[PDB]
Design an enzyme around this catalytic site. Structure first.
Site, PDB file in Angstrom:
ATOM      1  N   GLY A 176      -4.662 -52.121-111.033  1.00 15.87           N
ATOM      2  CA  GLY A 176      -3.242 -51.734-111.014  1.00 15.87           C
ATOM      3  C   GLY A 176      -2.537 -52.228-109.752  1.00 15.87           C
ATOM      4  O   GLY A 176      -1.348 -52.582-109.780  1.00 15.87           O
ATOM      5  N   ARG A 191      -5.110 -55.133-104.543  1.00 12.58           N
ATOM      6  CA  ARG A 191      -6.506 -55.204-104.970  1.00 12.58           C
ATOM      7  C   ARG A 191      -6.732 -56.547-105.668  1.00 12.58           C
ATOM      8  O   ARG A 191      -7.817 -57.114-105.586  1.00 12.58           O
ATOM      9  CB  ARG A 191      -6.888 -54.053-105.888  1.00 12.58           C
ATOM     10  CG  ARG A 191      -7.184 -52.763-105.146  1.00 12.58           C
ATOM     11  CD  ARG A 191      -8.010 -51.826-106.021  1.00 12.58           C
ATOM     12  NE  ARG A 191      -8.265 -50.565-105.334  1.00 12.58           N
ATOM     13  CZ  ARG A 191      -9.006 -49.584-105.834  1.00 12.58           C
ATOM     14  NH1 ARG A 191      -9.567 -49.703-107.024  1.00 12.58           N
ATOM     15  NH2 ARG A 191      -9.168 -48.473-105.118  1.00 12.58           N
ATOM     16  N   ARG A 219       8.441 -58.988-108.249  1.00 10.45           N
ATOM     17  CA  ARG A 219       8.288 -57.554-108.023  1.00 10.45           C
ATOM     18  C   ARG A 219       7.048 -57.246-107.211  1.00 10.45           C
ATOM     19  O   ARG A 219       6.482 -56.147-107.280  1.00 10.45           O
ATOM     20  CB  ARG A 219       8.272 -56.787-109.362  1.00 10.45           C
ATOM     21  CG  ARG A 219       9.600 -56.805-110.092  1.00 10.45           C
ATOM     22  CD  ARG A 219       9.443 -56.479-111.581  1.00 10.45           C
ATOM     23  NE  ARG A 219      10.743 -56.413-112.251  1.00 10.45           N
ATOM     24  CZ  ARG A 219      11.527 -55.345-112.322  1.00 10.45           C
ATOM     25  NH1 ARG A 219      11.207 -54.179-111.782  1.00 10.45           N
ATOM     26  NH2 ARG A 219      12.683 -55.451-112.982  1.00 10.45           N
ATOM     27  N   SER A 251      -9.878 -47.784-111.172  1.00 14.97           N
ATOM     28  CA  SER A 251     -10.462 -46.566-110.660  1.00 14.97           C
ATOM     29  C   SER A 251     -10.051 -45.444-111.625  1.00 14.97           C
ATOM     30  O   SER A 251      -9.036 -45.586-112.319  1.00 14.97           O
ATOM     31  CB  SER A 251      -9.926 -46.206-109.268  1.00 14.97           C
ATOM     32  OG  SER A 251      -8.512 -46.192-109.314  1.00 14.97           O
ATOM     33  N   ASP A 283     -13.055 -40.116-107.926  1.00 17.28           N
ATOM     34  CA  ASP A 283     -12.896 -38.696-107.613  1.00 17.28           C
ATOM     35  C   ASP A 283     -13.308 -37.865-108.823  1.00 17.28           C
ATOM     36  O   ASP A 283     -13.370 -38.394-109.939  1.00 17.28           O
ATOM     37  CB  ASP A 283     -11.430 -38.425-107.263  1.00 17.28           C
ATOM     38  CG  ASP A 283     -11.112 -36.967-106.996  1.00 17.28           C
TER      39      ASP A 283
END
Ligand SMILES: Nc1ncnc2c1ncn2[C@@H]1O[C@H](CO)[C@@H](O)[C@H]1O
Ligand SMILES: Nc1ncnc2c1ncn2[C@@H]1O[C@H](CO)[C@@H](O)[C@H]1O
Ligand SMILES: Nc1ncnc2c1ncn2[C@@H]1O[C@H](CO)[C@@H](O)[C@H]1O
Ligand SMILES: Nc1ncnc2c1ncn2[C@@H]1O[C@H](CO)[C@@H](O)[C@H]1O
Ligand SMILES: Nc1ncnc2c1ncn2[C@@H]1O[C@H](CO)[C@@H](O)[C@H]1O
Ligand SMILES: Nc1ncnc2c1ncn2[C@@H]1O[C@H](CO)[C@@H](O)[C@H]1O
Lengths: 237, 237, 237, 236, 234, 237
Positions: free
Chosen positions: A20, A24, A43, A90, A204
């Site tokens: 996303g 990265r 953008r 993630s 997480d």
């Protein structure tokens, strides 16, 4: 030459890895690809094309959420000839069978978005990855000594959900991780006749709150990117 | 100190202008604000804080789509104490009463997203702006001799819609412009007890397709930004 | 001659004030308008036409509920040439920011009815008032020293709701008052290309329990009607 | 149980299930060794025998999501079944799929409300177990048969009042139309078990292509062999 | 006293006949009941109570639409002890098996309203009349030589529908008449544990265009409703 | 022949009694009809045709659930000319007013299935039986001195429901019994212009778990069948 991508046909490989975060995508291009050059920056959504073991592969961010990634994936497929999309992200885990640092693959992606209902006469469209891509990623992981968990992701509409009780429902139904894009990417792939896959690292645990060091998370992310890239070579066979 | 914004409480003003493109936030900060300093850059989603006629104002991109802007607006309100959000964007027109280069204000925002149904027990939540903000923007435009059209925007889920016939329904119902965020921003403002407004310029006519030059386009955007910034000062009176 | 209104074209002014009770329409015609004459009485739904400062104004009851007011408003617009509708009603409050005897304006109107989904391809239509009418009413009130609360009304389907927990959701989302018609009137105005506004006085408080008397209510009602009539002249410009 | 007159242990931990109990009888008699009938309530025949020494059961599931949900739920919760392989027939809607093709539903779309009832009215992607899909695809490859892996559509109304939906299924690449996989997959997720639906294309809903009875039987036979071989691969 | 009815407990009988128009309630009370007295008039929604062959019977308007009739029927049941509600209305026909001037009974009532989904966990509640009331009305009509069409009414939300194609669906599914209340009255009766029935006369045809005789047919409907009350008591 | 019935036009009477279990159809044919001959056996779904007091009547299983019974009922009506369908089954009670061994008649059938929404433009179709069939069955029971309870059945999608709290809603709303087919049969009858009725005996009380002996159960079933068969003769008058 498209409204959200300032590139030309041929600038992208036929396989694009997509996290996303555009930063990265920059990290993947600089550290995992050879001779990667930037092909778009509208953008600030950076995209690059380089080689992995001689094979041409592109990497580009998709932004956050189903509407954002749908725009980018649609344009890549219809305007740039992209055949396969591998989201490399993630996710948060909700089931006790999944642990932080695990690598999960969304063979399917559940969602609370209305996009697939808009496409499919308000019925239930099972948003799925391409089987051969899933198989290639699972085999690539096995070759690296990593056991991936293959199942359903949940692509959420509201990161700050007003309904946290839904996480218990996801847990009960065996969702392997919560992210915000796979169901939308899979919907576009079915609509435009292309192929997609979402592979994610568990960063997480939504139910337990488990934590790790930044180093551990980076190591797992790196492992997942290598698996995704290796899977492209396996997929070419 | 939030997952998507690398800033600290106090870095943002209590009023934030938000275009979808972070490079447009950079342009606004450099050309319309005095002494603007960058306060965030995670995922390349640039945010800045400076002054306008002595009044502290921040400007930050929100990305594309309801899920993306919902994350940023929720964090600004709950973690950074932001009280008013003014989305400053572009939109497509579907009605003959609206023309390219027109400035439209979304007093309401219709949508095909499920986010407000998720929040409001699956009933119809009228996603509305804050009235005093709408009024301040209309009066700011009047002071500049700029006509504004106040009505309903349509915040779309799929830019590449599989249902273009919906544009005719939007036309019949008086929608003033099609964008992808206002209904989500309005939903967050109501959920978190803050205030929001979406002001947009018509960049294209989905039905006819009027055309302009780059200069004309840039001039209309500048007009929208002046109206928005002036509305903050009027709103403070 | 329509099925529910026994009047002829020209009997109604282009602006019609509408309470739910036909006896309230009668009270308005006799005490606030000059030379008012009754123009309809089918089903005891009284409608009158008179003048306010020389300007022709009509007043008529709309009955209770979305389906009922929809019939009357549609007929006034399509068969009698009515351009603007001002619902002048009563509502119950659910939020602590709103007090009994307060005057509220529904810039938007949420609802649990399916009528706007029937009209808008099962998507979310934001049922909104006409902005210029909202502004005229707010300015008329401000000139009289009354601070109107402008926000979302909730137009209920079931007065005796089987789901009272929904009142807590209305409170959290900032609903200014609960009535049973505004969202339907707003839907008709959009469908037929007309303009509407719903102004209501708060008779009771659903959350705290605060109540009122007949005398206090009558006084507040008179103020509302004076604001509505003055708003018509402001709107004329 | 109320719909199965057997006892714990009568079923193997893997059960193949066609919709027709007479097809379950055919499979038991012709593909399994020493298969014995273990249930017959409501004529829904179920049998247990061996395939190359491995204990395997076969039982009908009836037609439609509600029917197969009852049987699969009972097999998993009351008889300890771990894996369910629906072995059926389906109608094709896309030109890329041909009659006699063997398709595998990695996912199953549907117009039923059962998964919405389970999943807070959101979209549950009804999916098979990955390792079961992989084993079936590998078993087919070993037999020289190309399987098409994708989404099935599990219909509520065989005599649909909305035939225009077939065009939507075609556009979205549905590989075959049947009436159970989405329900079986929903039960497997709810009860923590594993499932797979493999089907032969018996008819083309869009084109109407025909084939002899013999050709259809040969293809069905091929598919049953693939399913049984997939159990052995899955055991590794 | 309630917010919409200015009467006292005992003012209404345990059975109430209800047309949508309060002036029709007045007409019924004055011409079909004995010694009828007005018991309510809030919002001009007239309600009366009198006798039919010595049996106490009330008649009151319910207004137009599901939300309107729901308020009145709920208050009659929970605040005035009413046990049975007989909607006596008018409807439009959509099927060729039904003719103008026909008397129809809604054993069920379909609807495009969301009220029963709100009540029934978003599932399908079949809004139905009380069987014994349906039977009593059908037998009362048969004795009078009137052949009632018993089936599903369609209680519409929008009289001026933005979707006229739905009338063809109603026709295909056998809907006997289009009105705007029965499904809501039936929903209230189930929620509150009371009994209801909607009998209507066909004022016109939506599919064929046949128009309309109304007074005569209306009188017959009221005679059937009243006789059905006595049969129901036995 | 048809895909699920291996019979020919004329093999079935114009009235068909249908339990869910084909072995119960066999039992009815052998014990309540004279000279019944089996007319179908595809998928072991046994169907028979014989006479009852000289009147030709057929009996056939319908399987379990809405989708299963919909296939059989549709084929009987459209391919075999069946005019009336009487489902004769068992059900579970949820209300205190209903007791085990009671005979209930579904004048209506509520459901959590989506089939009638698919047929009826996503609105509420009241799935109802044919009134004359209901009346004939109630009168047949009266003649035998058997009390019957006429009301709404609930045709469930999931026998093993994930939402047992819905039983309390069913109770509150007066549902007389829970089965899995009547709403579907009623939907098919309306779509195909035929007539149907569902008569059931209460075999269990979902709330109290009331109990009986096999003999008592068999006796109640025989009572239901006699009522159903007698209703056919009454219906012919
Ligand atoms: N717990 C989570 N919930 C939603 N999205 C998540 C989560 N964890 C990681 N993500 C990913 O990161 C972004 C949200 O921080 C999304 O774009 C998604 O891809
Ligand atoms: N016609 C349009 N439809 C949707 N979004 C639009 C349109 N025109 C401009 N936008 C804006 O730009 C982006 C899509 O290009 C969205 O984030 C939205 O704010
Ligand atoms: N609390 C309330 N809920 C619903 N409608 C209300 C309420 N208070 C006042 N009203 C108004 O009065 C009627 C119901 O008494 C409705 O027609 C509506 O306009
Ligand atoms: N075209 C089809 N549509 C639906 N179900 C089908 C179709 N073809 C085969 N089937 C299967 O056979 C039965 C319907 O004949 C279902 O139980 C399903 O498993
Ligand atoms: N065609 C019709 N559609 C809707 N309601 C009708 C119709 N005909 C008569 N009615 C009745 O009259 C009113 C609308 O005129 C409603 O309250 C309803 O009871
Ligand atoms: N409690 C019950 N719930 C659902 N179906 C029931 C119940 N009792 C009996 N049945 C009937 O038996 C079958 C389920 O065992 C269904 O086909 C239905 O007709």
């Amino acid at each position: 030459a498209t409204p959200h991508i300032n590139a030309q046909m041929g600038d992208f490989a036929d396989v694009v890895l997509m996290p996303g975060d555009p930063l990265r995508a920059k990290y993947i291009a600089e550290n995992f690809l050879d001779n990667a050059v930037q092909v778009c920056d509208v953008r600030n959504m950076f995209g690059y094309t380089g080689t992995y073991k001689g094979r041409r592969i592109s990497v580009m961010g998709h932004g956050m959420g189903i509407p954002s990634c749908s725009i980018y994936v649609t344009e890549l497929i219809k305007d740039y000839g992209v055949k396969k999309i591998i989201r490399v992200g993630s996710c948060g885990a909700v089931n006790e069978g999944i642990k932080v640092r695990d690598v999960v693959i969304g063979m399917g992606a559940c969602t609370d978005s209305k996009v697939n209902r808009i496409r499919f006469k308000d019925h239930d469209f099972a948003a799925i990855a391409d089987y051969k891509m899933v198989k290639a990623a699972e085999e690539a992981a096995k070759a690296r000594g990593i056991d991936v968990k293959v199942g359903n992701l949940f692509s959420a509409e509201l990161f700050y959900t007003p309904d946290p009780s839904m996480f218990d429902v996801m847990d009960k139904y065996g969702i392997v991780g919560v992210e915000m894009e796979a169901a939308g990417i899979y919907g576009v792939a079915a609509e435009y006749g292309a192929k997609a896959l979402a592979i994610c690292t568990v960063s997480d645990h939504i139910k337990t709150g488990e934590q790790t060091t930044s180093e551990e998370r980076q190591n797992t992310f790196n492992e997942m990117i290598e698996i995704a890239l290796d899977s492209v070579l396996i997929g070419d066979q």
